Amino acid sequence: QVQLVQSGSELKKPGASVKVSCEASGYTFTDYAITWVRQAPGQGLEWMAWINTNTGNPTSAQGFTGRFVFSLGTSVNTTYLQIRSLRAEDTAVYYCARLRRGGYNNYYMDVWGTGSMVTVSSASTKGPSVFPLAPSSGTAALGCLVKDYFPEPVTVSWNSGALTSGVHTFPAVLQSSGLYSLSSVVTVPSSSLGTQTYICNVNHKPSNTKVDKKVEPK
Amino acid sequence: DIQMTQSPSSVSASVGDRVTITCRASQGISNWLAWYQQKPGKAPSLLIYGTSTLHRGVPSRFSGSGSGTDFTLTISSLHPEDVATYYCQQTNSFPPKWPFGQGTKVEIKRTVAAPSVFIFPPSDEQLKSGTASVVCLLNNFYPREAKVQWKVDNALQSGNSQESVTEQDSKDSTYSLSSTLTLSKADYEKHKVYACEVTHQGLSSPVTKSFNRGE
C-alpha cells in the first residue's frame, strides 16, 4: 500500500498561482523526505527540490527558488508545491517522489507519485464531445472519438475497465483550434457485435465532464 | 554548470539483444549514479541506485557499472516489456545540482507485420453539429514508418488530416496509428467516395479502404 497520491490536473492563467498536493500513504510521511521532479511535454526529467518533512526547509536547484514554494501543512501526511507567476514554461507534469540516502551524493527516488499535469493558459476549460466509431467492416474494430477538449488529460476505459485486451487509446493530438482530440479503439470478436454491448467511459476532470457512449453498428 | 551526457539518444535492438546505455558527467560529482525507467504514459520508476544495486523487483537483466564520470547501464536480454525511456542522474548535495541524463528511448526490432486497416465514417451525431471526422485505423503493425493518403472522390488530400501513433506495445512490439480526416459538413456532403490508401513495407502493394455515404 506504499504509494504517493498527488492532486489532479490544473488549468491556470498566466500570472496566476497553482498549489499541488502530495499525500503519503502506506508509510510514515515524516520518516523520509519528499522530492519534486518536473517533465515538460515531450521532454526529459528535470529535478526541482527536496523538502525535509520534519523541519520543512527546502533545497532547490537554482532555477526553482522564490517563484517556487515547497511547504509542509498542518496535515502530517502532505507536502505541497506552489508556482506563482505561472509562465508558459511551467506547463508540465510535476512528479512527487520519496527521497532515499544511499550515502553522500548517493541520493535516489524509490517511490514516485502518479504526477500532476499543470497547463498554463488564459483559455477556459472545455469538455470533449464523444462520438462512436461504429464497427462496420475474423475480428472487428470499434472506438470512441473524444474531440475538442482542453486542457489535457483525458482517461478512456471500456466497459468500466472490464475490457482491456485489444484496447488502443491513442495519444492526444493538438488541432488548429487549439483544442485536443484523441480516439480510443478496441478490437472484439466480429460475431459478438450483436450480442455484447461495448461502452467507452471518457472522463475529463478539469471540466468535470463524464460521458458513457455506447458503440454499436449503424 | 554540471550536466549528464547520455548516449545513445535512442536505440533499436532485437529481442534478446545486449543493450548498453552510457552516461558521462561533464565533471566528477560522485561515484554513485541512479538509473530510472519511464514506460509510456507512466511515471518513472527506480531501476538502479548506487551505480550497481538493483531496486527490488527489477529483473537481473538490468546491470549497473561505472565510477568517476563514466557509467553504463546494461540490459542482458531485451525483453518485450522493456520498452521505455531510461534516465540517469547524479546528485550533488552542497551545491544543489542533480542533473538528469537527456534520456535514451529503447524500442524493439521484430519481424515485419502488415497493418489491419479500418475506416470509420463520421457519426450522425457529429454531422448534426456541423463537422465530419473520418478515421483511418492501422492496427498492430511494425515498423512504425507508414504512409496514409486520404483520397476523396480520387482527389489526393493534404492539410486536413492528422495522425496519432501509440508507443510500441509491451507484448507484441507492434504499433497502432489513427489518421483523422476533419471536414466541414458541407464539404463532406459534397463528395461520395472517401478512402485512405495505406502504404507499408509489410504490404506487397498499397491497400485502400473506402466507403460511399449512406451505407
Binding site: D31, Y32, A33, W50, N52, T53, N54, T55, N57, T59, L99, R100, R101, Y104, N105, Y107 | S93, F94
Partner: peptide
C-alpha cells in the same frame, strides 16, 4: 529511520 538528518549534514561537507 533517521535518514533525513544525514541529508542536511551532507551539505556541510566542505
Amino acid at each position: 529511520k533517521n535518514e533525513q538528518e544525514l541529508l542536511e549534514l551532507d551539505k556541510w561537507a566542505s
